[PDB]
Symmetry: C5
Subunit: 52 residues, 5 copies
């Protein structure tokens, strides 16, 4: 291999400045964006309910 031990070692070396179970990093970026769309929606609705 040498090619993998080099790539995996390159990450653990540049990722020693983070603290997440990985899975949360990926799930959060995607789940977040979709969560944002729904958040901005319920938001605009609030503002409207106030103008009534």
């Amino acid at each position: 291999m040498e090619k993998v031990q080099y790539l995996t070692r390159s990450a653990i070396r540049r990722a020693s400045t983070i603290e997440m179970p990985q899975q949360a990093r990926q799930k959060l970026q995607n789940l977040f964006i979709n969560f944002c769309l729904i958040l901005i929606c319920l938001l605009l609705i609030c503002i409207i309910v106030m103008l009534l």
Copy 2:
């Protein structure tokens, strides 16, 4: 195979905390986003019609 029975079994094992015909999960994330764009549009128009 062993490689598939391992991947399919890994999902049914981590997906036992869900209840959807799969198809709705995929169709909803994509159909939803597009639905959001149209929803936010008809929304801004409403607010405008009120400022007139």
Copy 3:
């Protein structure tokens, strides 16, 4: 290839509840989204011109 006649027949069977030249279905989803971005833009500008 029995494999194609099975896939093409599966669509014409589940698509008998639609009426579009196909091409409009694909062109509309993509052209629409891009059209939405430009629509929401000219929109925000309108609202602003009104607050002036």
Copy 4:
């Protein structure tokens, strides 16, 4: 080839109704969207500065 002369000829045939150096078509769709996000941002800020 015959496969390429057929695909390239199919485009120049259906693209004879356009006038762009190609590069602008691709760069514009992507650069535009990103430009839109920044445009909508500076926009909301304007409206706010007016409500103050």
Copy 5:
């Protein structure tokens, strides 16, 4: 190789009109968009707090 020296040389040739450590270019486009979603959110909230 001749194929790589040709692609890498084609970039450094068309990128001599930029000044960024590369990494910031990629990290900024993605980090920016996500930053925008959060920015627009805290924004709508501000406006609301003002209508109260």
